[PDB]
Amino acid sequence: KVKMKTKSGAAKRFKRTANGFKRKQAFKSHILTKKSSKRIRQLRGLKMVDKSDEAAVRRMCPYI
Amino acid sequence: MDLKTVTGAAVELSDTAFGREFNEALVHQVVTAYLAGGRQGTRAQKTRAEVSGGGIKPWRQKGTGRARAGSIRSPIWRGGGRAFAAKPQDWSQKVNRKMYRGAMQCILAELIRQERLILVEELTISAPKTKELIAKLSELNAPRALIITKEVDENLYLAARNIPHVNVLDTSEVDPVSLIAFDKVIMSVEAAKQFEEAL
Amino acid sequence: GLRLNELSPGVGAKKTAQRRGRGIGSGLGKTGGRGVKGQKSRSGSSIRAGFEGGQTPLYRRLPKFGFTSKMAMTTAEVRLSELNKVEGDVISVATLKTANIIRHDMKRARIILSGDVTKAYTFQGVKVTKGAKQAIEAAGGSIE
Amino acid sequence: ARVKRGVQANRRHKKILKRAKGYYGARSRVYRVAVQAVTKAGQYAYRDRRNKKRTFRRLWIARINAGARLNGLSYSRFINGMKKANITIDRRVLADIAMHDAATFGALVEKAKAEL
RNA sequence: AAGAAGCGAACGAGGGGAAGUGAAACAUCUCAGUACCCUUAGGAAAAGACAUCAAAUGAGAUUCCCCAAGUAGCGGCGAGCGAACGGGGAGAAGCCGAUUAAUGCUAAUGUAGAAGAACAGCGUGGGAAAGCUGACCGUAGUAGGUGAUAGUCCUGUAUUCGAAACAUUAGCGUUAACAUAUUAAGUAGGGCGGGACACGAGAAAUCCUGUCUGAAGAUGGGGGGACCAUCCUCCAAGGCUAAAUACUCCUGACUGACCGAUAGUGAACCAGUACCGUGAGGGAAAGGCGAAAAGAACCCCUGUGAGGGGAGUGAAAUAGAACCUGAAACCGUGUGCGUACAAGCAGUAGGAGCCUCAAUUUAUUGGGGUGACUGCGUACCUUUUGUAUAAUGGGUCAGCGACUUAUAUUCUGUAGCAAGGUUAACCGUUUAGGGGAGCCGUAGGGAAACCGAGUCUUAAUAGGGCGUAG
Numbered sequence: 001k002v003k004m005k006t007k008s009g010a011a012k013r014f015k016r017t018a019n020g021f022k023r024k025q026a027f028k029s030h031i032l033t034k035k036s037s038k039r040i041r042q043l044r045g046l047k048m049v050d051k052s053d054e055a056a057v058r059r060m061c062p063y064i
Numbered sequence: 065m066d067l068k069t070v071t072g073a074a075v076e077l078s079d080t081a082f083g084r085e086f087n088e089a090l091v092h093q094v095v096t097a098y099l100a101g102g103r104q105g106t107r108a109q110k111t112r113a114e115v116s117g118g119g120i121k122p123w124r125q126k127g128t129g130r131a132r133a134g135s136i137r138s139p140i141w142r143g144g145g146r147a148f149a150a151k152p153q154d155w156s157q158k159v160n161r162k163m164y165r166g167a168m169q170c171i172l173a174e175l176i177r178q179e180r181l182i183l184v185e186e187l188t189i190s191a192p193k194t195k196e197l198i199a200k201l202s203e204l205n206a207p208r209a210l211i212i213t214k215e216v217d218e219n220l221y222l223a224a225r226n227i228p229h230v231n232v233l234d235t236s237e238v239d240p241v242s243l244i245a246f247d248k249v250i251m252s253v254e255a256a257k258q259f260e261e262a263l
Numbered sequence: 264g265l266r267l268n269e270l271s272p273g274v275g276a277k278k279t280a281q282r283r284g285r286g287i288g289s290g291l292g293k294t295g296g297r298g299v300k301g302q303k304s305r306s307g308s309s310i311r312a313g314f315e316g317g318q319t320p321l322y323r324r325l326p327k328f329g330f331t332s333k334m335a336m337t338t339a340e341v342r343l344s345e346l347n348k349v350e351g352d353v354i355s356v357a358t359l360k361t362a363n364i365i366r367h368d369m370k371r372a373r374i375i376l377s378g379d380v381t382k383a384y385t386f387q388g389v390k391v392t393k394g395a396k397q398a399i400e401a402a403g404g405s406i407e
Numbered sequence: 408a409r410v411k412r413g414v415q416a417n418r419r420h421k422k423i424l425k426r427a428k429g430y431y432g433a434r435s436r437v438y439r440v441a442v443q444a445v446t447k448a449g450q451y452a453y454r455d456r457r458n459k460k461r462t463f464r465r466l467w468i469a470r471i472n473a474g475a476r477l478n479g480l481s482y483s484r485f486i487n488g489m490k491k492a493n494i495t496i497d498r499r500v501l502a503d504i505a506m507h508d509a510a511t512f513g514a515l516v517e518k519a520k521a522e523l
Numbered sequence: 524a525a526g527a528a529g530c531g532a533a534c535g536a537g538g539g540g541a542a543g544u545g546a547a548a549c550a551u552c553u554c555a556g557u558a559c560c561c562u563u564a565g566g567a568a569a570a571g572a573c574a575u576c577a578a579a580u581g582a583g584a585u586u587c588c589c590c591a592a593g594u595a596g597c598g599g600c601g602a603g604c605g606a607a608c609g610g611g612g613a614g615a616a617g618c619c620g621a622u623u624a625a626u627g628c629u630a631a632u633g634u635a636g637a638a639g640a641a642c643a644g645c646g647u648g649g650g651a652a653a654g655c656u657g658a659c660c661g662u663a664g665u666a667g668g669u670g671a672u673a674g675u676c677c678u679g680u681a682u683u684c685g686a687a688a689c690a691u692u693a694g695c696g697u698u699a700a701c702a703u704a705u706u707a708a709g710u711a712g713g714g715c716g717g718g719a720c721a722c723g724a725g726a727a728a729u730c731c732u733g734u735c736u737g738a739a740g741a742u743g744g745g746g747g748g749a750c751c752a753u754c755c756u757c758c759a760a761g762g763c764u765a766a767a768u769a770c771u772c773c774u775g776a777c778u779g780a781c782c783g784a785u786a787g788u789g790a791a792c793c794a795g796u797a798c799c800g801u802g803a804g805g806g807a808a809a810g811g812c813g814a815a816a817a818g819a820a821c822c823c824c825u826g827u828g829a830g831g832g833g834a835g836u837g838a839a840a841u842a843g844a845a846c847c848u849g850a851a852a853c854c855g856u857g858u859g860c861g862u863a864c865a866a867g868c869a870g871u872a873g874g875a876g877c878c879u880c881a882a883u884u885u886a887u888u889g890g891g892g893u894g895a896c897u898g899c900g901u902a903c904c905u906u907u908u909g910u911a912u913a914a915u916g917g918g919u920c921a922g923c924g925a926c927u928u929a930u931a932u933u934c935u936g937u938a939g940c941a942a943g944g945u946u947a948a949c950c951g952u953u954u955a956g957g958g959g960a961g962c963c964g965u966a967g968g969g970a971a972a973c974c975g976a977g978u979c980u981u982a983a984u985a986g987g988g989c990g991u992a993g
């Protein structure tokens with residue numbers, strides 16, 4: 001049977017929450033000496049996917 | 065609820081199976097699904113791929129003064145393939161078990177409500193003879209009838225075979241369209257009880 | 264119970280489909296709602312999922328995170344309000360399976376406080392939360 | 408369920424060609440030309456339903472001007488005299504009177520001229 | 524002496540094996556082990572009995588279907604690719620001769636066939652089956668025909684049935700050909716290069732092998748996804764094995780919300796033909812009188828021509844053989860009106876005169892045809908900022924010609940059930956009934972373990988994040 005395929009790379013970046021999707025933030029992989037400790041604090045942890053982007057996230061991960 | 069046979073014997077049928085209020089939308093969906101389940105769906109046409117020949121470009125792209133062509137079997141050409149050629153289809157629907165049961169319930173209740181259901185104690189033809197059943201149905205005043213009996217007898221079937229607007233069914237092979245299509249229904253009390261249990 | 268001649272689906276049940284390119288009056292003639300000649304007006308055109316026009320897409324701007332746990336695939340959470348599907352008084356993983364509350368390949372089960380329990384049960388080999396445990400023994404059951 | 412278009416296409420084209428009766432050349436004979444001529448005819452007729460109300464007022468005013476100048480007044484003084492006398496006779500009826508009843512139009516001019 | 528060869532559908536197994544395309548370029552990758560080429564079977568083939576999985580109270584060969592699941596994974600972690608465990612079914616079988624070919628009996632089949640009910644009158648009509656009236660048969664009433672529509676006119680249908688001869692299928696018996704291991708070493712494992720595994724070298728198990736090597740052999744060995752220990756499981760290096768599964772050049776019966784002559788096969792017709800091409804190959808057009816030829820004796824014009832007019836036939840001959848109907852483009856003839864001093868998308872709104880039908884107690888209205896004269900008025904489509912545009916497209920007509928289908932998914936409506944809803948494959952004397960495997964909903968938080976109306980972060984019980992009718 002033919003089914004919709006998940007974007008397997010989008011599934012690795014997005015996770016289902018109750019009313020949205022959670023995500024990690026960018027700019028934390030490398031180049032971290034020059035960054036202030038406020039930015040190192042506040043770029044750590046989960047954000048929610050933006051309301052303008054959750055349509056694309058739903059199109060990309062249809063089974064989550 | 066409280067009905068009478070042709071003779072006069074009182075028969076008590078459940079209101080859930082013979083008194084449910086008529087739902088015409090549900091009855092329509094079930095009847096229309098039954099009709100779509102009669103379709104064979106066996107046909108096809110040919111696409112441009114499957115029409116004979118057509119592999120070469122009919123003329124060169126530029127310079128002839130002609131509209132460009134890729135195949136002589138394009139759907140634009142006479143003798144070309146069908147754009148959106150049909151293939152065999154499966155027309156059967158999924159009707160919910162409870163929707164089918166409720167539609168049968170609705171149909172039986174409506175038949176009683178418009179007096180198209182006739183309860184008889186039994187209907188047994190003693191010889192595989194068409195005239196005997198014609199007489200037995202003329203006294204019942206239902207010349208055009210669906211006779212529903214549990215355990216259809218192997219000579220009542222023969223007596224009914226040749227009568228035009230008469231069919232004999234066992235309660236397991238009754239369908240909504242059969243229940244709606246015939247002028248009268250002659251149900252035995254045993255078959256009414258079976259319908260009570262099934263629905 | 265009517266005639267085959269006079270059954271109707273009811274208002275709102277049926278909608279007529281749109282047919283593109285069937286004249287001016289239909290509201291869908293000529294282009295058929297596709298607008299004018301770009302990539303989207305063409306035949307095999309799509310909306311490519313995760314494509315922003317060449318800008319690196321969102322899911323590739325962001326980092327992958329987490330790992331997938333195999334242990335979570337075999338642990339089933341059970342609500343107190345599902346327990347009316349259980350035959351008997353014992354609540355074990357096998358009993359939950361035969362009630363179809365949990366999948367037959369689930370190894371573990373957890374009972375959480377979601378609904379209420381209507382009778383006394385004996386939870387044998389399942390994990391029970393604090394509120395679920397208090398509700399179970401308020402209904403009169405026990406956990407072992 | 409194959410549908411042939413012949414019968415409906417025929418009756419459809421016959422409606423257009425019937426509306427194109429009396430047109431010159433291809434305009435009453437061939438469908439591609441007749442259908443444009445019918446649409447343009449409808450467009451002209453729509454525009455001329457509006458324009459005919461202008462043309463007939465034009466005509467009435469011309470006839471009233473002639474009738475008043477026969478009696479010693481211009482149109483723009485005669486109409487002013489009617490509006491001052493509170494006479495509500497429309498230009499269609501005034502032109503009819505001027506054309507077909509000269510003495511009555513003389514009386515109307517006398518009333519307007521007494522009002523001025 | 525016995526065989527083979529060659530040909531011919533699809534499906535099988537095996538040896539080789541693209542590229543267009545997708546990745547919005549492209550090389551890894553995809554396409555795809557596809558197309559194609561080559562080899563060779565059988566009614567199926569292949570596989571198949573554990574050196575298999577599992578980690579549960581363990582199960583117990585192979586194949587196929589529904590789930591698991593677009594999950595776990597793989598992947599320029601891009602585009603994509605994509606399991607398994609297990610659950611529910613179909614089918615079941617294990618052996619060491621589950622072989623092949625004859626012949627001979629017994630049974631059954633098939634290959635021709637036979638019988639097979641019941642309607643008349645009247646009127647219309649060319650013709651009756653249709654109409655009116657009244658009958659009959661029915662285990663036979665929606666069959667095909669017959670001069671219009673027939674259960675009773677014909678062929679049929681229901682039902683009951685036949686075989687001298689030959690084939691086929693089984694069971695039995697017998698023959699003659701082949702086969703009949705005895706537990707497995709150049710093997711398992713290893714180095715190097717490749718390939719296959721969903722898995723692209725990866726931390727890469729497992730399988731295959733071109734190259735180089737190379738055991739233990741039951742006090743032993745293989746596997747359990749690097750690897751080690753423990754535990755479980757199973758014994759490779761001998762062979763075989765039905766069903767459930769794949770297909771259609773064909774035969775029979777039956778079916779169709781499949782086509783109806785530009786459709787449907789390319790092909791309803793003397794079609795793979797004519798025609799085109801050196802060739803491989805490409806590849807048409809083209810059906811219909813009438814119920815019955817009753818297909819027009821004879822006469823006349825004409826060249827013993829063609830063609831026609833009579834006569835005749837026929838219900839009908841503008842049904843006369845190029846023959847049903849007989850549209851349009853296009854081209855004639857006739858009648859009425861207009862038109863040879865007037866400038867243009869040819870109409871439109873007005874409007875005189877004429878012509879013609881009707882009324883009307885008699886030139887007035889009404890209908891129809893024409894349109895002197897006046898006003899206004901630069902086609903249509905497309906594409907554009909913008910088109911009379913000297914931008915595109917169309918010589919015209921007829922016929923055909925473009926948003927589909929399948930599956931997945933989301934939202935909306937509607938219907939049923941409702942904290943529940945619903946089964947799938949299958950089975951079924953088949954739209955029913957059964958089948959609860961599974962799926963969705965009913966709880967979230969967190970990477971996860973884990974906890975749970977909470978949870979995560981934190982030293983924090985603070986703060987903050989995410990949470991608190993299908």
Ligand SMILES: [Mg+2]
Pocket residue numbers: 849
């Ligand atoms: Mg003809």
